[PDB]
Amino acid sequence: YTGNPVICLGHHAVPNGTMVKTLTDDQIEVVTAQELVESQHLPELCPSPLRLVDGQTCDIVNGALGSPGCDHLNGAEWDVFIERPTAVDTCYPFDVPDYQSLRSILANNGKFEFIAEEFQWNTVKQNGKSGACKRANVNDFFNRLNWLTKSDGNAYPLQNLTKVNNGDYARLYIWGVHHPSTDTEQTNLYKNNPGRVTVSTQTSQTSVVPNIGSRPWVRGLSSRISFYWTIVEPGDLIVFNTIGNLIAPRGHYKLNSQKKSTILNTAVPIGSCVSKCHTDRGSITTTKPFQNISRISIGDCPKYVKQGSLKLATGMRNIP
Amino acid sequence: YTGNPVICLGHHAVPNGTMVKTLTDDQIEVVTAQELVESQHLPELCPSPLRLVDGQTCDIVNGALGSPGCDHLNGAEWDVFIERPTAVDTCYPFDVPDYQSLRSILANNGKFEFIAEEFQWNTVKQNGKSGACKRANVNDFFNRLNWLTKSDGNAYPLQNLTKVNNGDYARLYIWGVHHPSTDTEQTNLYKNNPGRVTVSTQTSQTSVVPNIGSRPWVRGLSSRISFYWTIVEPGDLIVFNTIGNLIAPRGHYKLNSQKKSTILNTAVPIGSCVSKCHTDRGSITTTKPFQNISRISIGDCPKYVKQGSLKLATGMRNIP
Amino acid sequence: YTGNPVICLGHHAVPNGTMVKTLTDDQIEVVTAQELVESQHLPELCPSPLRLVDGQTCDIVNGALGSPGCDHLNGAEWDVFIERPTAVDTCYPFDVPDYQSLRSILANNGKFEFIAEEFQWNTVKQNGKSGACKRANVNDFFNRLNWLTKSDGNAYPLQNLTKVNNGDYARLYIWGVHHPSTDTEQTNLYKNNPGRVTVSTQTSQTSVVPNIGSRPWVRGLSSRISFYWTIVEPGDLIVFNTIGNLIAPRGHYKLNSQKKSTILNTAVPIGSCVSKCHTDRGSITTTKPFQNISRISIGDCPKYVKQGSLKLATGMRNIP
Amino acid sequence: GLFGAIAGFIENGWQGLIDGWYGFRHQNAEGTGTAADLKSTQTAIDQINGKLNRLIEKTNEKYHQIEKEFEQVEGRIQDLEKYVEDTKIDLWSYNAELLVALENQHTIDVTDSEMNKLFERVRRQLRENAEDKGNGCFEIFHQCDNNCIESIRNGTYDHDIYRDEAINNRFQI
Amino acid sequence: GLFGAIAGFIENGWQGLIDGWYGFRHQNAEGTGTAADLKSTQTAIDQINGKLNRLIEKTNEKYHQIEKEFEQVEGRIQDLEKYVEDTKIDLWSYNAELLVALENQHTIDVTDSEMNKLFERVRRQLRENAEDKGNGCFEIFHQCDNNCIESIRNGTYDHDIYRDEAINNRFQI
Amino acid sequence: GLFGAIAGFIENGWQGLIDGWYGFRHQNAEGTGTAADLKSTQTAIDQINGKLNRLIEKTNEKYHQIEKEFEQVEGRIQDLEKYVEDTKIDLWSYNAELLVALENQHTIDVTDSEMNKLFERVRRQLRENAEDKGNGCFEIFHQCDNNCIESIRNGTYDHDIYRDEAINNRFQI
Ligand SMILES: *[C@@H]1O[C@H](CO)[C@@H](O[C@@H]2O[C@H](CO)[C@@H](O[C@@H]3O[C@H](CO[C@H]4O[C@H](CO)[C@@H](O)[C@H](O)[C@@H]4O)[C@@H](O)[C@H](O[C@H]4O[C@H](CO)[C@@H](O)[C@H](O)[C@@H]4O[C@H]4O[C@H](CO)[C@@H](O)[C@H](O)[C@@H]4O)[C@@H]3O)[C@H](O)[C@H]2NC(C)=O)[C@H](O)[C@H]1NC(C)=O
Ligand SMILES: *[C@@H]1O[C@H](CO)[C@@H](O[C@@H]2O[C@H](CO)[C@@H](O[C@@H]3O[C@H](CO[C@H]4O[C@H](CO)[C@@H](O)[C@H](O)[C@@H]4O)[C@@H](O)[C@H](O[C@H]4O[C@H](CO)[C@@H](O)[C@H](O)[C@@H]4O[C@H]4O[C@H](CO)[C@@H](O)[C@H](O)[C@@H]4O)[C@@H]3O)[C@H](O)[C@H]2NC(C)=O)[C@H](O)[C@H]1NC(C)=O
Ligand SMILES: *[C@@H]1O[C@H](CO)[C@@H](O[C@@H]2O[C@H](CO)[C@@H](O[C@@H]3O[C@H](CO[C@H]4O[C@H](CO)[C@@H](O)[C@H](O)[C@@H]4O)[C@@H](O)[C@H](O[C@H]4O[C@H](CO)[C@@H](O)[C@H](O)[C@@H]4O[C@H]4O[C@H](CO)[C@@H](O)[C@H](O)[C@@H]4O)[C@@H]3O)[C@H](O)[C@H]2NC(C)=O)[C@H](O)[C@H]1NC(C)=O
Ligand SMILES: *[C@@H]1O[C@H](CO)[C@@H](O)[C@H](O)[C@H]1NC(C)=O
Ligand SMILES: *[C@@H]1O[C@H](CO)[C@@H](O)[C@H](O)[C@H]1NC(C)=O
Ligand SMILES: *[C@@H]1O[C@H](CO)[C@@H](O)[C@H](O)[C@H]1NC(C)=O
C-alpha cells in the first residue's frame, strides 16, 4: 500500500451477460440486453378491443348472399371478419368472376345491413327454390336473391325495372345469372333460349349471356350461378333488364362511407383476452417493435421481419 | 484574480435555440436547425419549365375521342395533362372497358397528334350524328369517329378493311361498338340483328358482340357505346371486320417512342410562377428533401412522408 | 536533439490513396477502400449450379403446346428457362388471353412432364392438321392438342367428357377454341354454326363462344386459335363440353407442389462457367453486395442499385 | 469502444458494485471502500432509456391490406402481390438489422464515454495532488481520511488545502 | 456529447461570442478580452455544411406513376395499388426519421469534439507553464501581456521562454 | 476524426511504416529507429474486418419475380409493375448510399480512436518521466538505451526505476 491513498474509478459487471451484434462485431458481451423480435403468440384471437365476427361455417361471400348456415350474420358489424377454412357451400353451386374483389369489398365495408326492396317483376314466377339449397329440411334458396322463372302460361316477358338512389349512402346490389346445363333446361325455365341479363347505371353497364352446358354434379345439379355486383352512388340509379336467367336481388347492402374493416382467414378460436394485434396464428400482446410470427397481421402490430432474434444492448460491455 | 493570468476556452450560445430529436433524446436544444419537411405549397400550378396542357371541360379520354368541348386539344403536347374534376361528358354516352388503362396510355404518350386516314366503307351510311352530342347547336358526334349505319336500301354488307403500318411509329386506333336499347333499334340501324365487330392485327384480335337492352336515359338515349383501342406496331397491320355496330375510326394517333408524360387531376389554376414539382394541391418551390403536402407529386419533387416536421441540427448544443 | 530521448507515435500512409464518401465529406482520402457495386458481368450464362434449359427457337408457351421446333423440351426440367427473343411461331396462329399468366405458371412450375390421356370423342374426326404448322415437310399440328372436326357424314354431336383427378398432384390442362374467318368455314368444319366450348371443374367454369371474322393472313390462314388452361386439384375433376370449335387436350401437364423455377429472356449464350446469379446480360461472379448491371437478376444475387460506384473505406485517413 | 476506458485502460468491471453502473473504490489509512457514482450512472441510464423510448413507440396501424397466402398459382396478379410483400419484408428486415447494429455500437460507445468522463472529472478535481496510475486509479500524495475520500466523491474536494503536502511528496522538495 | 466538453466540463456557452463558434476569454494584468478561434469554427462549419450538401442534393424525378386516390371501392387491383403506395410511404418516413436522428446525434458529437480538440491544442501549447482549472480554463503561471495572450491564440507561443518562471511559480522552488 | 489524432495533432502519416498501421519512432543516444505496434494495428484491422464480414453476407436469393421490361405500353397493371420495381430500386439505392456514408464516417473515427488510445497508453506508462511535445512525440527526461525503448514499446517500462533522474532533469532540483 506504501501509504499514499488510492482511488480507483470503475464500472459494474455480472457473471454472465447477453451477446449482441454491432457494426464491427457479430457477437460481443454486454451486461443487459432486450429482445426486439416478438416470437410468441396467444393460441386465441382476442375479442377486445377490436370487434370480431366469426363466420362459423359461412364464408363472407355466402354470408352476403344469405346461404342457409348464415342467418347469424344478418346485421353484423365487424372490424375483422373471421373466416374459417372449414366453411362449406350449403346452397346453389355458384362462382363469382373476380371473386377476390367481391370478398375484399364485403370485408372492407364492415357490415351486413340489408335494405329490402320490393321489385315489381311481371308475369314471371318468383321465389324459385332448389334441392341444392336446403333450409331446415326443405328446398330453399339464397335469402338475398329471388330466382325468377317463366310463368305457368309459358311466358317470360322482357323485364325492365329501375331503382333510384335518392338516399344518403352508396348501395351494393348483388345479382346473378343462371347457367343451365342443357338447351331444354333453358327453355324449361325461361322460355326464351338465349337468355339475356343487362344491369346498368348512368355511367356503367355490365351485360351477361348465359353459358349452357354440363358442369360436374354438385349437390344434385350440373347447372351454375355466376354472381355480379353493382354499386349505385347517391343520385345514380340502377336498371335491371332481362329476358331470362336473372337471379334478382331482393334489395341492397348499405356501404359505409368510411371503409376500415378487413377479413382474417384462420382456424384459431376466439377466446377471452385483450389485444389489438391479430395474426392468422392468433393474437399477440407485446411491446416489441418487430415480430417473426406472421406476414398476416391486422391491427396495431409489430413489423413482420425475417430474423428470429434482434437483441438491443441496454448496458455497457460486460467484463467480469 | 490572484495575479496568475487565466485563459478560458468556450463556445457560443444564443438566448433561445431550436429543439431537435436525436437517437437518445426526443427534444434537446441546439443553436441552429433547418427544417427538412416542406409543408407550404403555392396555390397555383406553374406552367414552366414543364409543359402543362389544361383540359378545361374535357377529360383526356373525351379529348382523345374528339367530343365537342375538346377542339383546343387537337395537336397538343404535354409533360403533364391537367385534368379537371368538373369535366363533363358532352357527347354520346359511352364507357371504356379497362378505362384507366386507356387513360394511362393517352396521358403517358404525351400528345394528341391525329393522322387522318380514309377508310373505304362500302354501301353503309357514314358520319352518323346524334342529339346526345351537339356541336354549335346541331346534332354531331365524336370528331375522331365515324358512326356507320345501314344504307337507304336496308343493306349492311360485311365490311372488311385493312390498314398497313409501313411508317416509322406505332399507331393507336380507337374504335367503338354500339349497344342498342332494343332489338328493333338494332335492326333499324344495322339490319343484321346480332351485330359483330372484330378488330385484329398479326398477333392479337379483340372481338366484341353488342349487348341489347335499356340503360338509364343519358342526354336523350338509353343506348351506349363501348370504346376499345388497338396499337399497331411498324410492320404490323390492322383489319376491321364488321356486320354491324362498329363505330369506326377516322385515322390513328401517333405514339411517341419514348413515353415520358403524365396526368394530374386537380382544380388548382395554372398561374405564371416557376417550379418543376407539382401536386394535386399546387406546385411547390423548395430545397427541402421531404414534404408532407401530397402523395400525388409529379416532377422533381421532395419525398412524401407522414411527419409534419423533421429538424436537422446545424449547430452545437445551446446552453445560454 | 538536445540529448533528451524522443519517442514519436504515428501511423502509416501511402503515396496515393482512394477517395471515399462520408456523412460530412463528399470525397476524403483513405489508405485502402473496397468497391461495393459490381459493374462487370460474364458474356455467357453459366450452366451450374442452376439447371438451365435453352428454349432455342421455342417460346415456353409454344414449348407447352408442342409446336414443331419444340420436341427437345419434352420432359425438360429447369430452375431457369432461357427464352430467346429470336423465337418464332411455327404452327397455327394463336393467342392466349392473359398470356403472361400462362407464361408465368409454366415458367414457375419448372417442368414439362406430359401425361397422355385418351379422350373418347364420339363421331367427330380427330387429329386435324394444317398447312400453317408443318412438321418435317408435312401438314401437322400442336403435339399436345387434338383438333376435332365434323365427321364425313356431316355430324358434330354434343361432346361431354370427364376426367377425374384421383392422383397425387395437380393437373394442368391446356385447351383451345378455334375462331374461323367466315361463317361457311364454321359450318364446313363444325356443322353447328354458333359453336360452343365449356370447360368446368367442381368450383370453376370457363366458357367460350367463337368469334367469326377475317384476321390478317399468317402462314396461309386468317383464322385463329385462343388457348385457355384449367388446373385440376386432386379430388376434383374436369368436364369438356362442346358442340364445335374445341381444340382438345391430349392429356395434362404435371404441376410440382413447390413451384420455385423462373424464366429469363435473353440472347446471351450458355457457356461453361460456374455462378449462382444470372442477369439478362449474363451471369455475374462477385462477392460485392450490390450491382448496377441489371434489374433482371435471378438466383443468389447482389441488390440492383442506381449507383455506378460505392467505395467502402477499409483503412484510416491517408496523409502522406 | 472509441474511448478505450471500458475494455481498455480499466481492465475489468466490478461484480460487487450493485447499486450503480460506475463507482469509486478507495484504500486509505483508515481502510477500503466502494461507493456508486449517481450522476454518471443516471446520465448513461437516461441516454439508453431514450433509445428504448424511441423504439417502443408503436405507430404502424393497418387494417385492410392484400392477400398474402394462395392455395394455387394464378398468374400475373398473384405474382405481383407476392413480389410486393417480399419486397416490403426484405426492406423492413434490413432496417431492423441495421437499426440494432447501429444502436448497439453507439450504446457501447456511450457507456465507455461516461466511464471516461467520470475519470476526467476526478482528474481535474485532484489537480496536482494525485497521479494517474494507468488503470483507472489515482495515487494521492497526501493522507486522505474518509471525509476527504467522500469530498472527492461528492465534488467538494479543495485541492489547495493539500497542494503543498502533495507536491512535496510527489517531487521531494 | 461523447467528449463531455460542451454541456460538460465547460458549464455553459457565451452569448457575447458572436463572430465564431469557439473562442478564448482571458484575464491578465492589462485586463480581459475575448476573441474567436477561426480554425475550430471553420472545421465544424465545414463538416455540418457537408451533411447539408448530402441532403439538399435532390435526385428523385418521377413522371408517370400510379393512381393514388379513388372515388369508390373497386376490389383487388385497387387494394394492391393502395398497399404499394402505403408501403412506400411508411418506408420513406422511417428513413427520414432515422436519418435526422442519426445526423443530429453525430452533429452534437462533432461540435463537442471540436470544443475538446481546441482545449487539447492549447493544453499542448502551454506544456508545463499552466494548469487546467477544470472548467475549460488554464491558470498560467507566468505574466502574459496582450502579445503573449495573442501568441497563445495564434499558435506561436514558445513555452521555453517562460518555463523557468512558470515552474518556479507552480511548485515554489 | 472525433479524436483529432490522425489528421490532427499528428501532422502526417509515415510511408516507411510498412509492417503495421500504427507504430513508434525514436531517437536516443544510440540512434534512431521505428517499429510497428501490433496490438493497436490488430484491433483496428479486426474492427474493419468485422464490418466487411457484415456486408459480404449474401442473403438475397430470388427466383420467380415479376416482368421488368415491356416492349409496348399496356396500361394499368404494367404501370403498377413498373412503379413497384422503381420504388424498390430507389429504396435499395438509398440504403446502399447511407450504409456506405455511415460506415466510412465510423471507420475514420475508429482508426483515429486507435491512434489516440496508443498515444494514451504510452503516456500512462511514462508517468512523470516524459512530456508530451504536442505532435505525437514524448520528450523523455532520462537516458533511454535501446532496451529501455523496447521496454516502452512492449509495455514493461518501469517508471520508478527512472523517476528521480527524470524529475530532477524536468524541473532542475
Ligand atoms: C355429361 O357428363 C357428366 C359427367 O359424366 C354427367 O354427369 C353425371 O350425371 C349423373 C346423372 O345425371 C350423375 O349421377 C348422380 O351422382 C350422384 C352422386 O354421385 C356419387 O356419390 C354417391 C353418394 O353421394 C354414390 O352413392 C354414387 O355411387 C356416385 O358415385 C348420385 O347421388 C345421383 O343419384 C340420383 O340419381 C340417380 C339417377 O342418375 C338415381 O338412381 C339415384 O337414386 C339418385 O336419385 C335421385 O332421383 C330420384 C328421382 O330422379 C329422387 O326420387 C331421389 O330423391 C334422388 O335424389 C346420380 O347418380 C353423376 O354424378 C354426374 N357425374 C359427374 C362427374 O358430375 C352428365 O350427365 C353428362 N350429360 C349427358 C347428357 O350425358
Ligand atoms: C325501361 O326502363 C327505363 C328506366 O326506367 C325507362 O326509361 C325511361 O324512359 C322514358 C321514355 O323514354 C324517359 O323519359 C325521358 O326523360 C327525360 C328526363 O326525365 C326527367 O327529367 C326531366 C328534366 O330533364 C323532368 O322534367 C321529367 O319530369 C323527368 O323526371 C325527358 O326529358 C324526356 O322527354 C322527352 O320525351 C317525352 C316523351 O317520353 C316528351 O314528352 C318530352 O317532351 C321530351 O320530348 C322529346 O321528344 C320529342 C319527340 O320524341 C321531340 O319533339 C323533342 O325535341 C324532345 O326532345 C323523356 O320524358 C325516362 O327518363 C327514362 N327513365 C330512366 C330512369 O331512364 C324505359 O322507358 C323502359 N323501357 C320500356 C320499353 O318501357
Ligand atoms: C378481308 O381482308 C383481308 C385483309 O386484307 C383479306 O386478306 C387477304 O387475303 C388474300 C387472299 O386470301 C391474301 O393473299 C395471300 O397472301 C399471301 C402472302 O402475301 C404477300 O407476301 C407474298 C410472299 O409471302 C408476296 O409474294 C405477295 O405478293 C403478297 O404481297 C400469298 O402467299 C397467298 O398466295 C396464295 O394464294 C393466292 C390466291 O389468293 C395464289 O395466287 C398464290 O399462288 C398462293 O397459292 C396457294 O394456294 C394454292 C391453292 O389455293 C396452293 O396450291 C399453293 O400451295 C399455295 O400455297 C395469297 O396471295 C392476303 O395476304 C390477305 N391480306 C392480309 C393483309 O391478310 C381477306 O381476303 C378479305 N376477305 C374477303 C372475304 O375478301
Ligand atoms: C421465430 O423466431 C424463433 C426464435 O426466437 C424461432 O424459434 C422460430 O422458429 C421463428 N419462427 C419461424 C416461423 O421461423
Ligand atoms: C404538414 O405539416 C405541418 C407542420 O409543418 C402541419 O401543420 C400540417 O397539418 C401537415 N399537413 C397535413 C396534411 O397533415
Ligand atoms: C455501372 O457502373 C460503372 C462504374 O463502375 C459504369 O461505368 C457503368 O456505366 C454503369 N452501368 C450503367 C448501366 O450505368
PDB file of C-alpha atoms in Angstrom, chain B residues 136-273:
ATOM      1  CA  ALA B 136     -72.583  24.581 -82.271  1.00  0.00           C
ATOM      2  CA  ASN B 137     -76.294  23.935 -81.786  1.00  0.00           C
ATOM      3  CA  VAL B 138     -76.568  20.963 -84.165  1.00  0.00           C
ATOM      4  CA  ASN B 139     -76.516  17.172 -83.905  1.00  0.00           C
ATOM      5  CA  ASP B 140     -72.936  15.902 -84.237  1.00  0.00           C
ATOM      6  CA  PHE B 141     -70.555  13.165 -82.992  1.00  0.00           C
ATOM      7  CA  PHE B 142     -67.035  12.477 -81.788  1.00  0.00           C
ATOM      8  CA  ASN B 143     -64.567  14.101 -84.211  1.00  0.00           C
ATOM      9  CA  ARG B 144     -62.316  11.017 -84.449  1.00  0.00           C
ATOM     10  CA  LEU B 145     -65.118   8.500 -85.051  1.00  0.00           C
ATOM     11  CA  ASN B 146     -67.431   7.603 -87.911  1.00  0.00           C
ATOM     12  CA  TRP B 147     -70.784   6.121 -86.981  1.00  0.00           C
ATOM     13  CA  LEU B 148     -71.693   3.703 -89.790  1.00  0.00           C
ATOM     14  CA  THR B 149     -75.292   2.591 -90.264  1.00  0.00           C
ATOM     15  CA  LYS B 150     -77.278   0.669 -92.856  1.00  0.00           C
ATOM     16  CA  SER B 151     -77.959   2.176 -96.286  1.00  0.00           C
ATOM     17  CA  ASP B 152     -81.209   3.660 -97.583  1.00  0.00           C
ATOM     18  CA  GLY B 153     -81.757   0.306 -99.277  1.00  0.00           C
ATOM     19  CA  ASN B 154     -81.687  -1.553 -95.952  1.00  0.00           C
ATOM     20  CA  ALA B 155     -78.283  -3.157 -96.549  1.00  0.00           C
ATOM     21  CA  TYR B 156     -75.299  -3.545 -94.210  1.00  0.00           C
ATOM     22  CA  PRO B 157     -72.823  -5.733 -96.102  1.00  0.00           C
ATOM     23  CA  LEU B 158     -69.814  -7.343 -94.484  1.00  0.00           C
ATOM     24  CA  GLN B 159     -67.105  -4.719 -94.010  1.00  0.00           C
ATOM     25  CA  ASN B 160     -63.515  -5.915 -94.250  1.00  0.00           C
ATOM     26  CA  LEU B 161     -60.875  -3.164 -94.354  1.00  0.00           C
ATOM     27  CA  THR B 162     -57.110  -3.175 -93.831  1.00  0.00           C
ATOM     28  CA  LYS B 163     -54.566  -0.539 -92.922  1.00  0.00           C
ATOM     29  CA  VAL B 164     -50.871  -1.432 -93.072  1.00  0.00           C
ATOM     30  CA  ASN B 165     -48.350   0.262 -90.821  1.00  0.00           C
ATOM     31  CA  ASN B 166     -45.438   0.879 -93.169  1.00  0.00           C
ATOM     32  CA  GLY B 167     -44.453   4.025 -91.285  1.00  0.00           C
ATOM     33  CA  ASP B 168     -41.931   4.865 -88.605  1.00  0.00           C
ATOM     34  CA  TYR B 169     -44.063   4.858 -85.449  1.00  0.00           C
ATOM     35  CA  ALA B 170     -46.577   2.773 -83.552  1.00  0.00           C
ATOM     36  CA  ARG B 171     -50.196   3.690 -84.203  1.00  0.00           C
ATOM     37  CA  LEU B 172     -53.061   3.890 -81.727  1.00  0.00           C
ATOM     38  CA  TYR B 173     -56.516   3.261 -83.247  1.00  0.00           C
ATOM     39  CA  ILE B 174     -59.567   3.966 -81.057  1.00  0.00           C
ATOM     40  CA  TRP B 175     -62.847   2.355 -82.162  1.00  0.00           C
ATOM     41  CA  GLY B 176     -66.204   1.525 -80.620  1.00  0.00           C
ATOM     42  CA  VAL B 177     -69.173  -0.811 -80.572  1.00  0.00           C
ATOM     43  CA  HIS B 178     -72.730   0.483 -80.368  1.00  0.00           C
ATOM     44  CA  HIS B 179     -75.077  -1.234 -77.858  1.00  0.00           C
ATOM     45  CA  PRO B 180     -78.709  -0.518 -78.843  1.00  0.00           C
ATOM     46  CA  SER B 181     -81.519  -0.387 -76.321  1.00  0.00           C
ATOM     47  CA  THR B 182     -83.918  -2.735 -78.219  1.00  0.00           C
ATOM     48  CA  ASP B 183     -83.911  -5.359 -80.951  1.00  0.00           C
ATOM     49  CA  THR B 184     -85.891  -3.057 -83.207  1.00  0.00           C
ATOM     50  CA  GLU B 185     -83.319  -0.282 -82.806  1.00  0.00           C
ATOM     51  CA  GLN B 186     -80.616  -2.825 -83.642  1.00  0.00           C
ATOM     52  CA  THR B 187     -82.304  -3.762 -86.936  1.00  0.00           C
ATOM     53  CA  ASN B 188     -83.326  -0.132 -87.614  1.00  0.00           C
ATOM     54  CA  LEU B 189     -79.678   0.913 -87.508  1.00  0.00           C
ATOM     55  CA  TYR B 190     -77.726  -2.110 -88.753  1.00  0.00           C
ATOM     56  CA  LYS B 191     -80.209  -4.524 -90.469  1.00  0.00           C
ATOM     57  CA  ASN B 192     -78.407  -7.622 -89.152  1.00  0.00           C
ATOM     58  CA  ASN B 193     -79.590  -8.276 -85.695  1.00  0.00           C
ATOM     59  CA  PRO B 194     -76.686  -9.822 -83.838  1.00  0.00           C
ATOM     60  CA  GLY B 195     -74.136  -7.259 -84.965  1.00  0.00           C
ATOM     61  CA  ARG B 196     -70.455  -8.221 -84.870  1.00  0.00           C
ATOM     62  CA  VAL B 197     -67.114  -6.381 -84.576  1.00  0.00           C
ATOM     63  CA  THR B 198     -63.706  -7.998 -84.996  1.00  0.00           C
ATOM     64  CA  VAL B 199     -60.544  -5.911 -84.965  1.00  0.00           C
ATOM     65  CA  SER B 200     -57.281  -7.799 -85.369  1.00  0.00           C
ATOM     66  CA  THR B 201     -53.582  -7.479 -86.051  1.00  0.00           C
ATOM     67  CA  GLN B 202     -50.976 -10.154 -86.821  1.00  0.00           C
ATOM     68  CA  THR B 203     -50.540 -11.115 -83.154  1.00  0.00           C
ATOM     69  CA  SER B 204     -53.806 -10.010 -81.455  1.00  0.00           C
ATOM     70  CA  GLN B 205     -57.561  -9.924 -82.046  1.00  0.00           C
ATOM     71  CA  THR B 206     -60.157  -8.163 -79.887  1.00  0.00           C
ATOM     72  CA  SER B 207     -63.681  -9.246 -80.828  1.00  0.00           C
ATOM     73  CA  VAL B 208     -66.999  -7.895 -79.491  1.00  0.00           C
ATOM     74  CA  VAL B 209     -70.706  -8.751 -79.637  1.00  0.00           C
ATOM     75  CA  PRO B 210     -73.159  -5.915 -78.825  1.00  0.00           C
ATOM     76  CA  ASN B 211     -75.413  -6.100 -75.775  1.00  0.00           C
ATOM     77  CA  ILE B 212     -79.034  -5.098 -76.337  1.00  0.00           C
ATOM     78  CA  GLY B 213     -81.171  -3.669 -73.522  1.00  0.00           C
ATOM     79  CA  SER B 214     -82.488  -0.490 -71.890  1.00  0.00           C
ATOM     80  CA  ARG B 215     -79.945   1.504 -69.832  1.00  0.00           C
ATOM     81  CA  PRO B 216     -80.685   4.703 -67.886  1.00  0.00           C
ATOM     82  CA  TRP B 217     -81.528   7.694 -70.058  1.00  0.00           C
ATOM     83  CA  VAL B 218     -78.490   9.966 -70.547  1.00  0.00           C
ATOM     84  CA  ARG B 219     -78.813  13.064 -72.797  1.00  0.00           C
ATOM     85  CA  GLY B 220     -81.791  11.607 -74.646  1.00  0.00           C
ATOM     86  CA  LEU B 221     -80.680   7.999 -75.134  1.00  0.00           C
ATOM     87  CA  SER B 222     -80.782   4.608 -73.446  1.00  0.00           C
ATOM     88  CA  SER B 223     -78.162   3.135 -75.817  1.00  0.00           C
ATOM     89  CA  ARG B 224     -74.399   3.133 -75.192  1.00  0.00           C
ATOM     90  CA  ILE B 225     -71.056   2.917 -76.958  1.00  0.00           C
ATOM     91  CA  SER B 226     -68.127   0.883 -75.647  1.00  0.00           C
ATOM     92  CA  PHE B 227     -64.690   2.079 -76.770  1.00  0.00           C
ATOM     93  CA  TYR B 228     -61.657  -0.107 -77.436  1.00  0.00           C
ATOM     94  CA  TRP B 229     -58.170   0.540 -78.705  1.00  0.00           C
ATOM     95  CA  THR B 230     -55.592  -1.277 -80.765  1.00  0.00           C
ATOM     96  CA  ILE B 231     -51.893  -0.493 -81.094  1.00  0.00           C
ATOM     97  CA  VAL B 232     -50.383  -1.334 -84.494  1.00  0.00           C
ATOM     98  CA  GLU B 233     -46.597  -1.671 -84.424  1.00  0.00           C
ATOM     99  CA  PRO B 234     -44.499  -0.752 -87.501  1.00  0.00           C
ATOM    100  CA  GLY B 235     -44.581  -3.677 -89.903  1.00  0.00           C
ATOM    101  CA  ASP B 236     -47.905  -4.901 -88.461  1.00  0.00           C
ATOM    102  CA  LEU B 237     -51.380  -4.119 -89.795  1.00  0.00           C
ATOM    103  CA  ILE B 238     -54.972  -3.793 -88.620  1.00  0.00           C
ATOM    104  CA  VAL B 239     -58.173  -5.325 -90.025  1.00  0.00           C
ATOM    105  CA  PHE B 240     -61.703  -4.074 -89.247  1.00  0.00           C
ATOM    106  CA  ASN B 241     -64.323  -6.749 -89.868  1.00  0.00           C
ATOM    107  CA  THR B 242     -67.934  -5.969 -89.040  1.00  0.00           C
ATOM    108  CA  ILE B 243     -71.516  -6.787 -89.909  1.00  0.00           C
ATOM    109  CA  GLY B 244     -72.922  -4.012 -87.744  1.00  0.00           C
ATOM    110  CA  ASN B 245     -72.428  -1.809 -84.657  1.00  0.00           C
ATOM    111  CA  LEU B 246     -68.875  -0.638 -85.439  1.00  0.00           C
ATOM    112  CA  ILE B 247     -68.133   2.990 -84.583  1.00  0.00           C
ATOM    113  CA  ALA B 248     -65.219   3.242 -86.992  1.00  0.00           C
ATOM    114  CA  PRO B 249     -62.015   5.278 -86.524  1.00  0.00           C
ATOM    115  CA  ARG B 250     -61.159   8.173 -88.831  1.00  0.00           C
ATOM    116  CA  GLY B 251     -57.423   7.585 -88.533  1.00  0.00           C
ATOM    117  CA  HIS B 252     -54.977   6.956 -85.738  1.00  0.00           C
ATOM    118  CA  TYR B 253     -52.960   8.745 -83.105  1.00  0.00           C
ATOM    119  CA  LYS B 254     -49.183   8.829 -83.259  1.00  0.00           C
ATOM    120  CA  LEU B 255     -47.451   7.190 -80.300  1.00  0.00           C
ATOM    121  CA  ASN B 256     -44.116   8.622 -79.164  1.00  0.00           C
ATOM    122  CA  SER B 257     -41.365   6.017 -78.891  1.00  0.00           C
ATOM    123  CA  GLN B 258     -40.338   7.484 -75.527  1.00  0.00           C
ATOM    124  CA  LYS B 259     -43.360   7.784 -73.233  1.00  0.00           C
ATOM    125  CA  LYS B 260     -42.461  10.366 -70.565  1.00  0.00           C
ATOM    126  CA  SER B 261     -45.646  12.346 -69.812  1.00  0.00           C
ATOM    127  CA  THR B 262     -48.352  12.014 -67.202  1.00  0.00           C
ATOM    128  CA  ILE B 263     -51.690  13.333 -65.992  1.00  0.00           C
ATOM    129  CA  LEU B 264     -52.716  15.249 -62.892  1.00  0.00           C
ATOM    130  CA  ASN B 265     -56.329  15.609 -61.795  1.00  0.00           C
ATOM    131  CA  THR B 266     -56.841  18.863 -59.907  1.00  0.00           C
ATOM    132  CA  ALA B 267     -58.885  22.042 -59.774  1.00  0.00           C
ATOM    133  CA  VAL B 268     -55.844  24.241 -58.997  1.00  0.00           C
ATOM    134  CA  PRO B 269     -55.492  27.107 -61.527  1.00  0.00           C
ATOM    135  CA  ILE B 270     -52.445  27.485 -63.753  1.00  0.00           C
ATOM    136  CA  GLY B 271     -50.633  30.691 -62.841  1.00  0.00           C
ATOM    137  CA  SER B 272     -47.359  32.210 -64.011  1.00  0.00           C
ATOM    138  CA  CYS B 273     -44.779  31.042 -61.454  1.00  0.00           C
TER     139      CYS B 273
END
